[PDB]
Amino acid sequence: GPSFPEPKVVRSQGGLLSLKLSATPTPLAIAGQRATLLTYGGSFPGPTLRVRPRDTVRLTLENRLPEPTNLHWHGLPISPKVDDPFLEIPPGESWTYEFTVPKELAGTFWYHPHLHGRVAPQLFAGLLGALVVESSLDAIPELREAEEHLLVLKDLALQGGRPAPHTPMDWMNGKEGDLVLVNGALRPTLVAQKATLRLRLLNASNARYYRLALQDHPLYLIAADGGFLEEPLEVSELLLAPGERAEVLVRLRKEGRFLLQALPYDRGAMGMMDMGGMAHAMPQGPSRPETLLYLIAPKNPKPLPLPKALSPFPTLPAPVVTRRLVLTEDMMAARFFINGQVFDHRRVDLKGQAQTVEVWEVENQGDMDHPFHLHVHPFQVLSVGGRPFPYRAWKDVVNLKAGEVARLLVPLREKGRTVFHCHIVEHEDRGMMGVLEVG
C-alpha cells in the first residue's frame, strides 16, 4: 500500500494497551522472497506499540517457539520484577507483562527476547518490535507538523528460507547479515510529503553498526536512547550501535533523490587467515557501505524552523559511589568478560541503593567495539574516550570503541535484581553480562 513500509501500530485505548502477542515461526514474504522467521504478532518487525505516560500496558506473550523465551522491555525504567531478565516462558506457555508507563518518559524503546544463551539466535530470526512513548512535546508545531516515520534498522541472512545458522565466527564477532533492511524491507523508497521529517531510529540488529548519513543533508538529533535532548543537535553523521535509538529531524533542502546510507565502519570484527605458518586472526576492516533507503524530497521543500528547545534534562543529586567495569575478550574462545568474570545468574556483582546516583566508569580493554547496556536505570553519558558528551539526554546503551573509557551518571530507580551486558547479543550469550541488585 504505502510506498514506505512501517510496522503496524497498536495504540493504547483510554489509557490501556491490552494485547496478546504470540512468538511464532511465521511464513512471510521478505525482500522479495519467502522465508520462515520468528515473529511477534505474525510480522517482521513486530507491531509498534504506541503509548503515553501513565498508560497501563498489559501484554500477554504466548510462546509458540520450540524453546523457552521471554521479553525485555529495552530502555523502559520499570521494575525488574516486571522486566524480568531471568524469567523463562516454556514452550506452549504464556506470561502477562503488566506495567505503568512512567510519568517522565518519552522516546523510542523496543521489546525483544532476553533468555541468556538464546538471545542472539532468537533476535536474529526476527523477534523484535518497537515501543513508542508519545509526549506532550510532540504537540509543539515544529514537531507536530513534521512527517513522522519509524525506521527499524535490522539486517538478516537467509539459508534455505530460514534465518542463517550461527557459526563459531558469528559467536565471536556477533552475526551480521547480507540483507540490510529497514522495517523488514530491502532499500524502500520514502516519498516525503512534507519538507521536515521526524525519524525515529532503532538499531535492532545483533551486531551490525549503522554509521548513518543522508546525502547532502545534516541530521538534527532531538532524542537519544531514552529521552529528548535539551535542544536539537546538528550532526553530519550518526552512529547507531546495536540496541541504541535516536530521533532526528531532517530538513529537506531541495527537490531530488537522496540516499540514506550506512557508511563504512570498522567495529573490530575479525576473520581468520593462513599464509604459511600463520593461522591467526585478522581484522575484517570496515563494513561495506549500504544504502538504507531512497528519500524523495517534495516539490519546493520549505522545512519548518527547528524547535528552539526540547526538554530540560533533570538536575541529578551528587553521586555516592564510583564503579569501574572493565571489558575484555578471549576472541578465539569466543568468551567475553566484565571485571574478569562471565555471567552467573546466581552471583550478584554490584549492590546499589535506590534513589542514589552512581558514577560508572566502563572501560573497553578489548579490540572490538562493545555497546554497553544497563537495564532498568537510564543513565547520562558524561564522556567517552576522554571527550565530553555534547548533549544531555537519557541513554541506556553506550558504545565503547577499543581502549575507550565511558563515564556514566547512573541514578538508581526501581529496586530489585537486574543485569548489564554488551548489546552485541552473541557476546551477552557468551558471558559478557553481570548482575546489579538495587535495594
Binding positions: 72, 74, 112, 114, 280, 370, 373, 375, 421-423, 427
| CB 424, min distance to Cu ion, A | 4
Contact 96, 56 (CB under 8 A): no
Cα(367)–Cα(379) distance, integer angstroms: 25
Q: Closest Cα partner for 149 from 289, 3, 364?
A: 3
Residue 424 sits in the site that holds Cu ion (CB under 5 A) = yes
Q: Please, what is the minimum distance in Å from the beta carbon of residue 7 to Cu ion?
A: 17
CB under 5 A: which stretch of 99-107, 219-227, 350-358, 415-423 binds Cu ion? Answer: 415-423
Q: Which is nearer to Cu ion, 184 or 243 (CB)?
A: 243
From candidates 222, 422, 435, 436, binder to Cu ion by CB under 5 A: 422
User: Which span sits near Cu ion by CB under 5 A: 138-146, 224-232, 243-251, 387-395?
Assistant: 243-251
CB atoms within 10 A of CB 159: 9
Amino acid at position 88, single letter: E
| Residue 118 touches Cu ion, criterion: CB under 5 A | no
Binding residue for Cu ion, selected from 52, 175, 370, 377, defined by CB under 5 A: 370
Selected binder of Cu ion within 427, 430, 431, 435 (CB under 5 A):
427
Contacts of 248 (CB under 8 A, 6+ apart): 198, 199, 201, 219, 220, 221, 222, 238
Number of residues located near Cu ion, criterion CB under 5 A: 8
Segment lying near Cu ion (by CB under 5 A), choices 127-135, 192-200, 370-378, 387-395? 370-378
65-94 mask for Cu ion (x: CB under 5 A)?
-------x-x--------------------
Q: Which stretch binds Cu ion (CB under 5 A): 199-207, 314-322, 339-347, 366-374?
A: 366-374
Is the CB of 2 or the CB of 340 nearer to Cu ion? 340
- Take residue 296 and report the three cell numbers written for it: 524523495
CB of 356: closest distance to Cu ion in angstroms?
A: 21
Q: Are 421 and 114 in contact (CB under 8 A)?
A: no
d(CA 19, CA 184): 22
Nearest to 188 by CA among 293, 291, 274: 293
Range 45-70 burial, b when 16+ CB lie within 10 A, else e: bbbbbbbbeebebebebbbbbeebbb
Assess 243 for contact with Cu ion (CB under 5 A): yes
CB of 375 to Cu ion, least distance (A): 5
To the nearest whole angstrom, how small is the minimum distance from the Cβ of residue 372 to Cu ion?
Answer: 8
Print burial letters for 324-338: b (CB count within 10 Å at least 16), e (below 16).
ebebbbebeebbbbb
Under a CB-based contact definition with an 8 Å cutoff, are residues 11 and 47 in contact?
Answer: no
The least distance separating Cu ion from the CB of residue 128, rounded to whole angstroms, comes to 9
Furthest CA-CA distance within the chain: 69
Q: Is 116 in the site for Cu ion (CB under 5 A)?
A: no
Interacting residues with Cu ion (CB under 5 A): 72, 74, 243, 370, 375, 422, 424, 427
